[PDB]
Amino acid sequence: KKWLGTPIEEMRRMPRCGIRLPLLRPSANHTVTIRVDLLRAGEVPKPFPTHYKDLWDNKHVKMPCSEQNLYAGSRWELIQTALLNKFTRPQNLKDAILKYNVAYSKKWDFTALIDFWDKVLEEAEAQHLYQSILPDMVKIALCLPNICTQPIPLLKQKMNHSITMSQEQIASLLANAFFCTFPRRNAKMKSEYSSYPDINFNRLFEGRSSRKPEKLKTLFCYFRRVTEKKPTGLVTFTRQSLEDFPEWERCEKPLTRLHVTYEGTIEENGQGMLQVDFANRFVGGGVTSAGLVQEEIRFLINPELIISRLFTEVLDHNECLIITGTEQYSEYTGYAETYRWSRSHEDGSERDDWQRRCTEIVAIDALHFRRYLDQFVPEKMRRELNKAYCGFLRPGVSSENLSAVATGNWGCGAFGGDARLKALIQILAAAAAERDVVYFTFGDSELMRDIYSMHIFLTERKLTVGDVYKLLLRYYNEECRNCGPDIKLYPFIYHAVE
Ligand SMILES: Cn1c2c(c(=S)n(C)c1=O)N[C@H](SCCN1CCOCC1)N2
Numbered sequence: 001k002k003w004l005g006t007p008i009e010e011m012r013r014m015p016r017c018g019i020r021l022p023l024l025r026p027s028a029n030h031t032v033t034i035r036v037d038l039l040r041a042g043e044v045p046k047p048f049p050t051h052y053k054d055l056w057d058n059k060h061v062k063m064p065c066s067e068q069n070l071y072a073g074s075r076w077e078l079i080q081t082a083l084l085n086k087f088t089r090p091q092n093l094k095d096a097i098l099k100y101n102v103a104y105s106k107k108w109d110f111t112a113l114i115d116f117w118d119k120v121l122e123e124a125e126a127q128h129l130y131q132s133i134l135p136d137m138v139k140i141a142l143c144l145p146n147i148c149t150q151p152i153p154l155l156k157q158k159m160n161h162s163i164t165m166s167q168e169q170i171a172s173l174l175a176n177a178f179f180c181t182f183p184r185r186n187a188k189m190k191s192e193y194s195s196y197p198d199i200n201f202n203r204l205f206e207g208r209s210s211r212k213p214e215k216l217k218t219l220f221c222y223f224r225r226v227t228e229k230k231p232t233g234l235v236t237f238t239r240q241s242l243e244d245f246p247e248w249e250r251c252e253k254p255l256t257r258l259h260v261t262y263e264g265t266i267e268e269n270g271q272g273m274l275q276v277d278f279a280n281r282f283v284g285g286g287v288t289s290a291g292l293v294q295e296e297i298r299f300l301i302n303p304e305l306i307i308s309r310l311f312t313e314v315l316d317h318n319e320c321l322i323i324t325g326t327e328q329y330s331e332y333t334g335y336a337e338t339y340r341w342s343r344s345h346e347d348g349s350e351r352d353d354w355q356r357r358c359t360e361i362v363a364i365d366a367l368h369f370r371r372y373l374d375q376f377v378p379e380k381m382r383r384e385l386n387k388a389y390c391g392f393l394r395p396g397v398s399s400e401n402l403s404a405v406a407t408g409n410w411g412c413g414a415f416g417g418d419a420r421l422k423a424l425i426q427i428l429a430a431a432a433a434e435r436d437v438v439y440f441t442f443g444d445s446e447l448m449r450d451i452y453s454m455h456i457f458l459t460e461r462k463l464t465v466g467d468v469y470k471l472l473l474r475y476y477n478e479e480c481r482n483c484g485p486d487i488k489l490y491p492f493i494y495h496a497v498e
Pocket residue numbers: 264265266267292293294335336407408409410411412413440441442
């Protein structure tokens with residue numbers, strides 16, 4: 001069989017499982033950058049306030065259009081002068097970006113941009129790029145002060161805060177990131193923003209990886225779509241930091257339901273479910289540089305995710321980022337060296353009452369294990385349980401209104417995670433958050449069978465979260481602490497219980 005466990009049709013999903021949203025409203029913990037009183041299906045949202053207001057300080061994004069962005073001269077004026085020239089050759093665009101980035105004229109390589117334009121694209125495609133797409137991108141970038149009129153707070157460490165903005169606002173901000181206009185975000189030895197991801201796209205232009213043309217095709221598909229026809233919806237970005245975590249050894253909650261399959265994907269088959277992003281602590285990972293596995297791919301086919309890098313501080317152990325409403329603009333095949341842009345995607349997701357696409361993604365970063373056995377240390381197991389639990393828990397929401405979790409081999413691959421341990425950690429964390437699990441093994445049919453078999457074994461014997469966590473602790477003591485191990489985890493568990 002291609003899938004085991006509970007039928008996926010029986011799992012909860014949005015919008016059907018959600019409660020009616022309250023009235024969207026700004027508050028101390030919710031920044032809203034549009035006119036809620038004018039929000040209407042199929043209309044471009046109106047920015048609030050009407051006229052640009054600037055904050056240039058330690059708690060907000062430093063906007064390129066700020067009067068305090070100086071070089072004294074006005075850097076915004078220089079950006080306007082640089083970008084409003086006709087581009088007919090890729091050197092023109094390199095020279096323009098470097099006019100307001102003089103300090104990086106040696107450090108920043110543009111080989112991938114030059115090669116995309118001159119050596120990948122056919123003549124007609126290149127003409128469309130520089131006669132239509134790039135000029136349209138410049139115009140939406142330079143509209144920033146009329147589009148993003150309200151200061152954007154940083155989602156700093158330990159903040160429990162949300163930002164809701166329009167897709168159109170995000171497009172203006174991402175156009176600025178493409179043209180590398182965000183100040184104070186470039187220096188290798190920067191301090192103010194050293195704990196924040198890169199936002200400017202300059203590393204997307206460097207080098208000769210065969211992957212860069214596919215990244216650029218994916219992003220220009222998005223740019224071509226959102227400059228041609230303004231998107232009308234909203235997107236919410238929520239930083240969540242929990243202080244009260246389970247006493248896992250004492251948790252008497254039962255396990256929840258499981259659907260596990262080695263076919264399908266989170267983004268296609270997990271529609272309306274809580275979709276896990278296998279994140280870097282710096283959200284988005286290498287999306288704007290080198291990096292093209294699960295997180296980067298999702299950030300490329302849903303580019304509105306990328307703007308989280310503008311304002312999201314590196315995630316601490318007890319934190320996650322929840323993004324609701326991003327739209328899928330691209331389809332793809334493969335991953336890493338085999339990733340290819342396929343075609344434009346027409347997102348058919350419903351929108352909720354805040355005009356957000358019914359797509360919820362949570363970025364949770366797994367640990368990186370130098371040594372395989374390190375991940376069975378109890379402190380490290382607890383850390384991953386608590387990270388997933390934070391990602392899955394929705395304070396204030398009842399379990400019947402919680403979609404299933406759509407996830408997979410989180411932190412396995414480059415990070416060195418063991419898939420069978422990580423599957424059980426997510427199953428336990430979901431159980432504690434009272435959500436069902438939809439698990440994609442991405443071609444690994446044996447893993448599907450193994451996860452299913454363990455899950456049904458444990459549920460039929462009515463073992464609790466705490467019962468299972470204590471078995472993980474026994475495995476650490478017996479096979480790992482004084483030890484790769486002589487016996488694998490699931491065999492150990494079956495033997496210990498039987
Ligand atoms: C869309 N998608 C997806 C993956 C997974 S696992 N899942 C569940 C998914 O839905 N992997 C790939 S990218 C790197 C490949 N690695 C192989 C499996 O270990 C994790 C990552 N893309």
